Design a protein around this ligand. Structure first.
Ligand code: NI
Length: 341
């Protein structure tokens, strides 16, 4: 059945609730972003109103073949009325098209649903600054103090510098980046830009990127793999077997692979700095795991919540175990005692 944390009280609305069939009483289904755990259930046969960003709407129409008459895209940072209720969509700093949703209930209650987000101080000067928020439905993915990671800027500097050094030393090296969903596009785009190359990819991935409103995208991506020295492959294929096989297919154009896997967090974060990261190597193949996150670190999450000062927090991630739920509740109490709300 649909969990309580996907239902918005006092309304006919659900959030990211497409895998439960017809949810009784639901008059409008919101979709925060185009990631599969959130869209699961949508297809060309869906016939209820879906509310989302413009980018998410492009992906629904073109990738899932949802009919246009049921897609309701909303502009960002703009007050809109949906089934008699005022809503605002805000940038979530997650993947392209990802939003947080503010709901203004008829009775005076104000609710923020973060979707998936990476909290940033720039959010402290959006439309959030303009009123009190009573209830917060929070992306708690990394809600534990062991989860530190660097800024996105520091991780990109590392990737650019590593790729540029490798290809300048060996002009016959190929760079490969893994992907399995939208998000983390800066990794492969920034490397291609430093090397003066387009990024080569499958037709399916090219289609996906053409839906994202990225400026000058025709200038950065291509389906002509032969003309490119940065290739995108499925994340599954970023291992020694899969990369050896890919190198065979390039027909002696290249003699080395430098590959990147842009994972969220991996335990080496606890004891290491970004400057100190090293690859796994076998023969003429090296693989770097880089901690590029599109979710809040523990400290970023803490700062956001202590700034917002909500009356009630409802976690949306790690809710399946009593130990996880107890742990998160202890942190929320700490944060409230420190800040004084
Ligand atoms: Ni996501």
């Amino acid at each position: 059945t649909c969990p309580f944390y996907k239902k918005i009280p006092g309304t006919g609305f659900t959030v990211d609730a497409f895998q439960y069939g017809v949810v009784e009483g639901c008059t409008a289904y919101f979709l925060t972003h185009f990631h599969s755990d959130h869209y699961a259930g949508l297809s060309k046969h869906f016939t209820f109103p879906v509310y989302c960003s413009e980018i998410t709407g492009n992906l629904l129409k073109n990738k899932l073949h949802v009919q246009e008459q049921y897609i309701h895209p909303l502009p960002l940072d703009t007050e809109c009325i949906v089934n008699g209720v005022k809503v605002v969509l805000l940038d979530a700093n997650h993947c392209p098209g990802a939003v947080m949703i503010l709901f203004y209930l008829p009775n005076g209650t104000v609710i923020l649903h973060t979707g998936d987000f990476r909290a940033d101080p720039s959010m402290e000067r959006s439309l959030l600054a303009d009123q009190k928020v009573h209830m917060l439905y929070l992306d708690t993915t990394y809600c534990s103090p062991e989860y530190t990671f660097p800024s996105q800027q520091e991780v990109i500097r590392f990737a650019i510098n590593t790729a540029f050094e490798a290809v300048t030393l060996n002009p016959h090296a190929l760079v490969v980046c893994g992907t399995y969903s939208i998000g983390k596009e800066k990794v492969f785009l920034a490397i291609a830009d430093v090397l003066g190359s387009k990024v080569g990819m499958s037709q399916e991935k090219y289609k996906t990127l053409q839906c994202l409103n990225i400026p000058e995208i025709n200038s950065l991506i291509t389906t002509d793999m032969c003309s490119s020295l940065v290739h995108l492959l499925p994340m599954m294929q970023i291992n020694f077997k899969g990369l050896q096989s890919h190198l065979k297919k390039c027909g002696g154009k290249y003699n080395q692979i430098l590959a990147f896997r842009p994972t969220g967090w991996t335990h080496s974060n606890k004891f290491t700095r970004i400057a100190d990261v090293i690859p796994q190597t076998k023969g003429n193949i090296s693989i770097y795991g880089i901690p590029y996150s599109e979710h809040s670190s523990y400290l970023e999450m803490k700062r956001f919540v202590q700034w917002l000062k909500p009356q009630k927090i409802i976690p949306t991630v790690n809710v399946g175990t009593w130990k996880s739920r107890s742990t998160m509740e202890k942190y929320f109490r700490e944060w409230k005692l420190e800040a004084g709300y």
